[PDB]
Enzyme design. Structure first.
Site, mmCIF file in Angstrom:
data_model
loop_
_atom_site.group_PDB
_atom_site.id
_atom_site.type_symbol
_atom_site.label_atom_id
_atom_site.label_comp_id
_atom_site.label_asym_id
_atom_site.label_seq_id
_atom_site.Cartn_x
_atom_site.Cartn_y
_atom_site.Cartn_z
ATOM 1 N N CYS A 14 42.639 34.218 48.198
ATOM 2 C CA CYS A 14 43.782 33.914 49.043
ATOM 3 C C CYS A 14 44.413 32.539 48.797
ATOM 4 O O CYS A 14 43.814 31.669 48.160
ATOM 5 C CB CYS A 14 43.384 34.018 50.496
ATOM 6 S SG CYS A 14 42.100 35.275 50.782
ATOM 7 N N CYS A 47 46.111 35.220 53.175
ATOM 8 C CA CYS A 47 45.144 36.138 52.587
ATOM 9 C C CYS A 47 45.671 37.561 52.716
ATOM 10 O O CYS A 47 45.870 38.061 53.824
ATOM 11 C CB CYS A 47 43.796 35.995 53.308
ATOM 12 S SG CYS A 47 42.338 36.336 52.273
ATOM 13 N N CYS A 83 44.078 38.883 43.360
ATOM 14 C CA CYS A 83 44.937 37.813 43.829
ATOM 15 C C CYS A 83 46.331 38.415 43.776
ATOM 16 O O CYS A 83 46.485 39.607 43.495
ATOM 17 C CB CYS A 83 44.812 36.529 42.954
ATOM 18 S SG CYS A 83 45.995 36.353 41.637
#
Lengths: 124, 124, 124, 124
Positions: free
Chosen positions: C77, C82, C6
């Site tokens: 995302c 994303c 992430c």
């Protein structure tokens, strides 16, 4: 199941599918392409039939297919042009020489690479 | 200069280039494709020649072209398969109906859209 | 092994890893982020410890990690952003609400979704 | 107008905007980020104010912004993690060192690169 998609969907796409299916126990495979094509390569169907494999009856564009059905869409990309598909789903990229036209034994060479890759991929 | 790239590089890629150049004063244009093609569409060269435009002599794959030379590579994508190129450079995407095979007047319709888009794009 | 990446790598990234490992028999998991972060979320380590799970000791940026080691990099995302990673490898995208700041029970809700997704993902 | 978007939107995003505007005659600029942030960097606003420039009042996430409004969205990417946005529109990628934390003169160095790039970009 996995989805093997390339541009024109006449050879490689079809090769990976058939080889996958002959190696996978639980997973299945299908193929699709970015653009329309009338016939599946004759070199391919010959090459697969020589291995006791029937290629897909007719090329199916990725448009006639709802991607979300699959759980891993492997994309057979060119030397420098991997097409992206409309899915936040999982997708890989295989840079594989386009056998089209080259004919001769190049097709067999392409077949082998796809095989080495499918074999490896069928690990999961 | 801008680069108009599509898959097979036979029609649209070629159309946008010719129209662009006939409208741009300082910028110039070129085209390229993801996969090989022997001939530029006859419907296109006819359609462009009808407008006093000569299409490209022969389709040039994007492989025979070093992308960094350009300053804006516009990508003519399909209904759902925009090909990505190897460049941290600026690139757009135009979803344009593939005239291939459809022939008839569809080609002209495709020509018009490309024109409406090139005209607009030539704003800068 | 799979890689959960992430942006800031403090919560979700860490959550998915810990849950995955508690559910996967053969596969293992790691996590990484696009940008540096000093500490792993306290809400998370509390929430995982409440489930008998120890979060990662310290956030590790995806830069300090050689991607090719993994076999499936799942990307967590945002609502509409994303991040893409430098790999022709397989990667998915999970749109998961950023619990950061929101604190309260929102974190647990995020934990549950990640769990529903990891559980499902651990099918293979 | 162009849109400068980075992850957290506190420094670089804001720098490029301000410099762009001070150099462009017809085009304007705005900035946005992938994730929330409370304050615009103090080093930046100092650095810009030292050049007679006012940074953005407060970081605005790219979510609070309708992308289609722009005509070129330049994305300030990390060493290896260029975020993609939801737009078939034109977008570039600038790999710029994250000054965050590093503080010192590194910020000025980052300012300069952005300047060299904005100057060049303002060619069109």
């Amino acid at each position: 199941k996995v989805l093997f998609v390339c541009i024109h969907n006449t050879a490689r796409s079809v090769m990976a599918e058939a080889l996958f299916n002959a190696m996978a126990k639980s997973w299945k495979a299908e193929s699709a392409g970015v653009e329309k094509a009338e016939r599946v390569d004759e070199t391919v169907k010959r090459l697969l039939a020589e291995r006791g494999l029937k290629a897909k009856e007719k090329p199916r564009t990725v448009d006639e297919v709802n991607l979300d059905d699959f759980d891993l869409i492997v994309t057979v990309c060119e030397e420098s042009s991997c097409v992206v598909l409309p899915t936040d789903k999982p997708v890989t990229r295989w840079h594989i020489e386009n056998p089209a036209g080259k004919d001769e034994g190049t097709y067999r060479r392409v077949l082998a690479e796809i095989e080495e890759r499918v074999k490896k991929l069928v690990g999961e």
